[PDB]
UniProtKB/Swiss-Prot annotation, chain A:
It is linked to Microcephaly and chorioretinopathy, autosomal recessive, 1: A syndrome characterized by microcephaly, cognitive impairment, underdeveloped retina and choroid, and epilepsy in some patients. The more anterior parts of the retina, near the periphery and pars plana, have a grayish hue and diminutive vasculature similar to retinopathy of prematurity. Visual impairment becomes evident during the first year of life. This is Gamma-tubulin complex component 6. It is found in: Cytoplasm, Cytoskeleton, Microtubule organizing center, Centrosome. Component of the gamma-tubulin ring complex (gTuRC) which mediates microtubule nucleation. The gTuRC regulates the minus-end nucleation of alpha-beta tubulin heterodimers that grow into microtubule protafilaments, a critical step in centrosome duplication and spindle formation. The chain holds residues 305 to 506 of 1819 of the full protein.
Swiss-Prot record, chain B:
Component of the gamma-tubulin ring complex (gTuRC) consisting of TUBGCP2, TUBGCP3, TUBGCP4, TUBGCP5 and TUBGCP6 and gamma-tubulin TUBG1 or TUBG2. TUBGCP2, TUBGCP3, TUBGCP4, TUBGCP5 and TUBGCP6 assemble in a 5:5:2:1:1 stoichiometry; each is associated with a gamma-tubulin, thereby arranging 14 gamma-tubulins in a helical manner. Gamma-tubulin at the first position is blocked by TUBGCP3 at the last position, allowing 13 protafilaments to grow into a microtubule. It is linked to Microcephaly and chorioretinopathy, autosomal recessive, 3: A disorder characterized by congenital microcephaly and chorioretinal dysplasia associated with poor vision and nystagmus. Variable ocular anomalies include microphthalmia, retinal folding, retinal detachment, optic nerve hypoplasia, absence of retinal vessels, round areas of chorioretinal atrophy, and attenuated electroretinogram. Most patients have mild developmental delay and mild learning difficulties. Keywords: Cytoplasm, Cytoskeleton, Intellectual disability, Microtubule, Primary microcephaly. One of its GO terms (molecular function) is gamma-tubulin binding. The chain holds residues 1 to 191 of 667 of the full protein. The gene is TUBGCP4. Ubiquitously expressed. GO terms for cellular component: centrosome; cytosol; gamma-tubulin complex; gamma-tubulin ring complex; membrane; microtubule; microtubule cytoskeleton; recycling endosome. This is Gamma-tubulin complex component 4. It is found in: Cytoplasm, Cytoskeleton, Microtubule organizing center, Centrosome.
From Swiss-Prot, chain C:
Component of the gamma-tubulin ring complex (gTuRC) which mediates microtubule nucleation. The gTuRC regulates the minus-end nucleation of alpha-beta tubulin heterodimers that grow into microtubule protafilaments, a critical step in centrosome duplication and spindle formation. The gene is TUBGCP5. It is found in: Cytoplasm, Cytoskeleton, Microtubule organizing center, Centrosome. Belongs to the TUBGCP family. Widely expressed, with highest levels in heart and skeletal muscle and moderate levels in brain. Component of the gamma-tubulin ring complex (gTuRC) consisting of TUBGCP2, TUBGCP3, TUBGCP4, TUBGCP5 and TUBGCP6 and gamma-tubulin TUBG1 or TUBG2. TUBGCP2, TUBGCP3, TUBGCP4, TUBGCP5 and TUBGCP6 assemble in a 5:5:2:1:1 stoichiometry; each is associated with a gamma-tubulin, thereby arranging 14 gamma-tubulins in a helical manner. Gamma-tubulin at the first position is blocked by TUBGCP3 at the last position, allowing 13 protafilaments to grow into a microtubule. The lineage of its organism: Eukaryota, Metazoa, Chordata, Craniata, Vertebrata. Signal peptide: none annotated. It comes from the Eukaryota. This is Gamma-tubulin complex component 5.
Length: 162, 185, 329
């Protein structure tokens, strides 16, 4: 035998990063070197799994600030966390009494969201985490349009939510 | 090409699949190592991801984005919202099939591309059916209860996946009509 | 170097691009046959005729043949000039003298045209007739399992000894089966209104099963069921709901003749007209258990009791409610 030497279309995650490097090299030749992207390899799948597991807590690894195509995947699961933190800052305050009861109900929903993470995944794959938090994430972002982050308090709230 | 196909079909366009609104997803297909054989199977695979993008964009665009700010029944209203709620749950086996492909790739990455095309070939007839269903409602400004007939006359076809896929969405749009009838009578 | 080496070594790429291919081999005629034949031709004073056949190795021919027999297009080998796929005569392996190659690729291109025309017919419905649609669906249902068989054979090439003559006898119980659908649809396109173009279509399968009534009959019957599916739905709808509804002539009845339901057609029409006169004062779910328990002749004489007893009940109930309350007697 001398080994038939297979196609490149049946190969990837090692040929993929190589072929992406070749594509970037052709593009940087055709531009003249005025493009300059960092980290063409990294981040992997499982490290991003642990990172997005940390992102749903409300903390970051300082990747955001207020392969490389996965950022095109990452942003839509990124923009969920950026509104989720923006609700907990809207519950940082201990106001109306009906407004206090309203905000304690919002914190009781945040407790559900904090409980779903670290209890469902025993380190599942990335796209499963994204797909499970697709039908749930837009529902959470809907509540950011519901809440203030003026915003009504008292009767002007009690008829508005009614 | 292996992980990149999944990245593209998930609804996030890659660095090889140039996103356009007049060609959808399309490969560059000008590499100095291009094979003629890979072209046709890629041209077949791009269409389903292109349709999936518009479906998810439609459902996000018109369900859960207002708090009751005249209104139209083929852009807003409860019957279109019921249509989108049924729509997202009908696309769940597409997602589950995409989850099934990655396990096969992790078992061994040297798998044929025709196998992946063979897997996607059952959604391949259903997706062009539902595109004209959303397009007719959008064009003809179809208001309210007239949505209910529109899918129902299109469920007189003979393809089994089209009938079984449409019936769930029709059940949700029936459920809201039952919900108003429970109060009015 | 770095990326071009990973390409150059591990990817095949030489022959489907403009590049002279280099290939080591074990010389000495038994597989050096093309070069020995060229040496004899040049020693016999041709004069020159500078033939340029670039080169290919043998196994790549096997996989491109399998992709053509699948039904996908756009391959390097097999040029086509009017829609009929033919041999590319620009190639040599290390043997086959360019004449045995030209014949064997022609023989498999003959089946390539069979699968290519039918996938073109299947494409012209995928981008409204409702019996043609069932016919192309039957062919699609055959084709997906067929492509599964060749696709699993292709995976065993990546891993036995395989050549061209092995895979043609391996696909023998299917390439014999493919030739029949090239004849049933060609008479289904050879022949204005949709209803005559549906009736002469539906009579072709019903005749063609009885012609061969081993394994070919089961193939034709499995296509027959998926072609007769709309008509059964319409006769059941005409029975239970008491009105015939067409998509502008979807049936031969207007509220020439097919031989599939002819020996009970009289029992069907008096079933429709009786039920609407009853409305002024299921059957798929019994046909489908009948397939569980001479073939398509007496077995179809077992379908007819299901509609006949149901009809006797309908017309007898109309008779009963006319002999009282507007009592004729």
């Amino acid at each position: 035998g001398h080994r038939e030497e297979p196609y490149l279309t049946e190969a990837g995650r090692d040929a993929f990063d190589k072929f992406c490097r070749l594509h970037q090299g052709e593009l940087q030749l055709l531009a003249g070197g005025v493009l300059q992207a960092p980290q063409p390899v990294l981040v992997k799948e499982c490290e991003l799994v642990k990172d997005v597991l940390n992102v749903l807590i409300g903390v970051v690894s300082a990747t955001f600030s207020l392969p490389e195509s996965i950022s095109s995947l990452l942003s839509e699961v990124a923009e969920y966390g950026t509104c989720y933190t923006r609700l907990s800052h809207f519950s940082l305050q201990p106001k109306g009494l009906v407004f206090q009861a309203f905000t304690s109900g919002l914190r009781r929903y945040l407790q559900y969201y904090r409980a779903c993470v670290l209890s469902t995944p025993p380190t599942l794959s990335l796209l499963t985490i994204g797909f499970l938090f697709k039908k749930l994430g837009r529902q959470l972002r809907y509540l950011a349009e519901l809440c203030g982050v003026a915003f009504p308090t008292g009767v002007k709230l009690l008829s508005y939510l009614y | 090409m292996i992980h990149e196909l999944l990245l593209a079909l998930s609804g996030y366009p890659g660095s090889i699949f140039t996103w356009n609104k007049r060609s959808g997803l399309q490969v560059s297909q000008d590499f100095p190592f291009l094979h003629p054989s890979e072209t046709s199977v890629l041209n077949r695979l791009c269409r389903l991801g292109t349709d999936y993008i518009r479906f998810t964009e439609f459902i996000e665009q018109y369900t859960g984005h207002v708090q009751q700010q005249q209104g139209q029944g083929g852009l807003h209203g409860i019957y279109l919202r019921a249509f989108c709620t049924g729509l997202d749950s009908v696309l769940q086996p597409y997602r589950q099939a995409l989850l099934d492909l990655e396990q096969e790739f992790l078992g061994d990455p040297h798998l044929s591309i025709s196998h992946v095309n063979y897997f996607l070939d059952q959604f391949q007839l259903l997706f062009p059916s539902v595109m004209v269903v959303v397009e007719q409602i959008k064009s003809q400004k179809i208001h309210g209860c007239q949505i209910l007939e529109t899918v129902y006359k299109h469920s007189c076809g003979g393809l089994p996946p089209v009938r079984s896929a449409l019936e769930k969405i029709l059940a949700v749009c029936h459920g809201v009509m039952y919900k108003q009838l429970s109060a009015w009578m | 170097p770095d990326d071009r080496s990973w390409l150059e070594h591990h990817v095949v790429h030489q022959y489907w691009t403009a590049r002279p291919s280099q290939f080591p081999h074990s010389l000495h005629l038994h597989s050096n046959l093309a070069a020995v034949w060229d040496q004899h031709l040049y020693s016999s004073d041709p004069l020159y005729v500078p033939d340029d056949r670039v080169l290919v190795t043998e196994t790549q021919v096997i996989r491109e043949t399998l992709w053509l027999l699948s039904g996908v297009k756009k391959l390097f080998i097999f040029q086509l000039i009017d829609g009929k796929v033919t041999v590319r005569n620009n190639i040599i392996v290390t043997h086959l003298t360019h004449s045995c190659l030209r014949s064997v690729l022609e023989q498999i291109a003959a089946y390539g045209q069979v699968v290519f025309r039918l996938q073109e017919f299947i494409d012209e419905v995928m981008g409204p007739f409702r019996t043609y649609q069932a016919f192309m669906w039957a062919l699609y249902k055959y084709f997906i399992s067929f492509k599964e068989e060749l696709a699993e054979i292709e995976k065993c090439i990546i891993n036995t000894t395989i050549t061209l003559a092995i895979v043609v006898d391996k696909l023998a119980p299917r390439l014999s089966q493919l030739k029949v659908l090239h004849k049933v649809f060609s008479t289904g396109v050879a022949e204005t209104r949709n209803v005559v173009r549906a009736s002469h279509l539906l009579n072709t399968l019903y005749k063609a099963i009885l012609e061969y009534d081993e394994q070919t009959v089961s193939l034709l019957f499995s296509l027959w069921v998926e072609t007769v599916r709309p008509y059964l739905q319409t006769v059941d709808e005409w029975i239970v709901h008491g009105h015939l509804w067409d998509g502008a002539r979807e049936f031969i009845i207007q509220r020439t003749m097919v031989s599939f339901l002819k020996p009970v057609l009289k029992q069907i029409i008096m079933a429709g007209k009786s039920m609407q006169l009853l409305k002024n004062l299921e059957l798929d779910d019994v046909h489908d258990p009948l397939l569980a328990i001479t073939f398509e002749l007496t077995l179809r004489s077992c379908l007819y009791p299901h509609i006949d007893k149901q009809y006797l009940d309908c017309c007898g109930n109309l008779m009963q409610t006319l002999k009282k309350d507007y009592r004729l007697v």
